């Protein structure tokens, strides 16, 4: 029962538990992506401002 | 039978039993390797931060 329990727990952890190092890189990647997206959006708001030079 | 038992026990121990020192050296080598690797991964996780300054 000890042997089966430890192997069973290992098998369960291999499926449900998350590997923090595996996707903390993904988290940082997504943070960089969202920052770049916010910057590009804010750049996009001021894009039509050049029209006013013709009025 | 006594002599045969002691000889056979020694022969079996030559195979199944582990060497404590020659295992601890590898264990500590693996330890320094893994901590170096996790430090290197942690420092490599911040590479994209050099890009957002261009935004």
GROMACS .gro file of C-alpha atoms in nm:
model
  110
    1UNK     CA    1   0.000   0.000   0.000
    2UNK     CA    2   0.288   0.240   0.071
    3UNK     CA    3   0.445   0.165  -0.267
    4UNK     CA    4   0.114   0.194  -0.453
    5UNK     CA    5   0.026   0.518  -0.274
    6UNK     CA    6   0.354   0.688  -0.357
    7UNK     CA    7   0.341   0.578  -0.721
    8UNK     CA    8  -0.026   0.678  -0.747
    9UNK     CA    9   0.048   1.023  -0.604
   10UNK     CA   10   0.336   1.068  -0.847
   11UNK     CA   11   0.110   0.971  -1.138
   12UNK     CA   12  -0.161   1.212  -1.021
   13UNK     CA   13   0.089   1.496  -0.981
   14UNK     CA   14   0.226   1.433  -1.331
   15UNK     CA   15  -0.119   1.529  -1.469
   16UNK     CA   16  -0.282   1.792  -1.248
   17UNK     CA   17   0.013   1.977  -1.092
   18UNK     CA   18   0.164   2.266  -1.288
   19UNK     CA   19   0.535   2.319  -1.346
   20UNK     CA   20   0.602   2.674  -1.227
   21UNK     CA   21   0.926   2.713  -1.423
   22UNK     CA   22   0.751   2.582  -1.735
   23UNK     CA   23   0.501   2.867  -1.768
   24UNK     CA   24   0.645   3.152  -1.561
   25UNK     CA   25   0.838   3.222  -1.882
   26UNK     CA   26   0.502   3.226  -2.061
   27UNK     CA   27   0.372   3.469  -1.799
   28UNK     CA   28   0.664   3.707  -1.854
   29UNK     CA   29   0.624   3.670  -2.232
   30UNK     CA   30   0.257   3.763  -2.206
   31UNK     CA   31   0.341   4.061  -1.985
   32UNK     CA   32   0.585   4.189  -2.248
   33UNK     CA   33   0.323   4.127  -2.516
   34UNK     CA   34   0.052   4.317  -2.329
   35UNK     CA   35   0.288   4.609  -2.264
   36UNK     CA   36   0.380   4.626  -2.633
   37UNK     CA   37   0.013   4.605  -2.728
   38UNK     CA   38  -0.077   4.889  -2.493
   39UNK     CA   39   0.206   5.100  -2.633
   40UNK     CA   40   0.103   5.033  -2.993
   41UNK     CA   41  -0.262   5.108  -2.913
   42UNK     CA   42  -0.173   5.438  -2.746
   43UNK     CA   43   0.032   5.517  -3.056
   44UNK     CA   44  -0.272   5.429  -3.269
   45UNK     CA   45  -0.504   5.675  -3.091
   46UNK     CA   46  -0.294   5.975  -3.198
   47UNK     CA   47  -0.265   5.850  -3.557
   48UNK     CA   48  -0.554   6.055  -3.709
   49UNK     CA   49  -0.419   6.376  -3.553
   50UNK     CA   50  -0.232   6.459  -3.873
   51UNK     CA   51  -0.558   6.537  -4.052
   52UNK     CA   52  -0.604   6.855  -3.847
   53UNK     CA   53  -0.307   7.014  -4.025
   54UNK     CA   54  -0.532   7.048  -4.332
   55UNK     CA   55  -0.802   7.245  -4.148
   56UNK     CA   56   2.744  -2.321   0.524
   57UNK     CA   57   2.846  -2.031   0.750
   58UNK     CA   58   3.143  -1.948   0.528
   59UNK     CA   59   2.936  -1.982   0.211
   60UNK     CA   60   2.668  -1.754   0.355
   61UNK     CA   61   2.914  -1.480   0.444
   62UNK     CA   62   3.083  -1.500   0.103
   63UNK     CA   63   2.750  -1.494  -0.083
   64UNK     CA   64   2.625  -1.201   0.126
   65UNK     CA   65   2.941  -1.008   0.040
   66UNK     CA   66   2.899  -1.096  -0.328
   67UNK     CA   67   2.539  -0.975  -0.330
   68UNK     CA   68   2.631  -0.656  -0.143
   69UNK     CA   69   2.891  -0.588  -0.412
   70UNK     CA   70   2.598  -0.548  -0.655
   71UNK     CA   71   2.280  -0.422  -0.488
   72UNK     CA   72   2.418  -0.200  -0.211
   73UNK     CA   73   2.512   0.156  -0.305
   74UNK     CA   74   2.840   0.337  -0.242
   75UNK     CA   75   2.762   0.627  -0.011
   76UNK     CA   76   3.048   0.866  -0.087
   77UNK     CA   77   3.063   0.802  -0.463
   78UNK     CA   78   2.688   0.872  -0.468
   79UNK     CA   79   2.695   1.185  -0.252
   80UNK     CA   80   2.957   1.342  -0.480
   81UNK     CA   81   2.728   1.299  -0.780
   82UNK     CA   82   2.433   1.419  -0.573
   83UNK     CA   83   2.605   1.745  -0.481
   84UNK     CA   84   2.726   1.791  -0.839
   85UNK     CA   85   2.364   1.760  -0.951
   86UNK     CA   86   2.266   2.009  -0.680
   87UNK     CA   87   2.510   2.276  -0.795
   88UNK     CA   88   2.410   2.207  -1.156
   89UNK     CA   89   2.039   2.250  -1.085
   90UNK     CA   90   2.079   2.570  -0.884
   91UNK     CA   91   2.304   2.713  -1.155
   92UNK     CA   92   2.045   2.618  -1.415
   93UNK     CA   93   1.756   2.776  -1.228
   94UNK     CA   94   1.956   3.095  -1.174
   95UNK     CA   95   2.045   3.104  -1.543
   96UNK     CA   96   1.682   3.051  -1.644
   97UNK     CA   97   1.567   3.323  -1.405
   98UNK     CA   98   1.817   3.571  -1.547
   99UNK     CA   99   1.738   3.467  -1.905
  100UNK     CA  100   1.367   3.526  -1.844
  101UNK     CA  101   1.422   3.905  -1.852
  102UNK     CA  102   1.573   3.927  -2.202
  103UNK     CA  103   1.264   4.072  -2.379
  104UNK     CA  104   1.269   4.368  -2.138
  105UNK     CA  105   1.543   4.513  -2.358
  106UNK     CA  106   1.296   4.555  -2.643
  107UNK     CA  107   1.014   4.760  -2.490
  108UNK     CA  108   1.241   5.065  -2.460
  109UNK     CA  109   1.204   5.103  -2.838
  110UNK     CA  110   0.829   5.156  -2.792
   0.00000   0.00000   0.00000
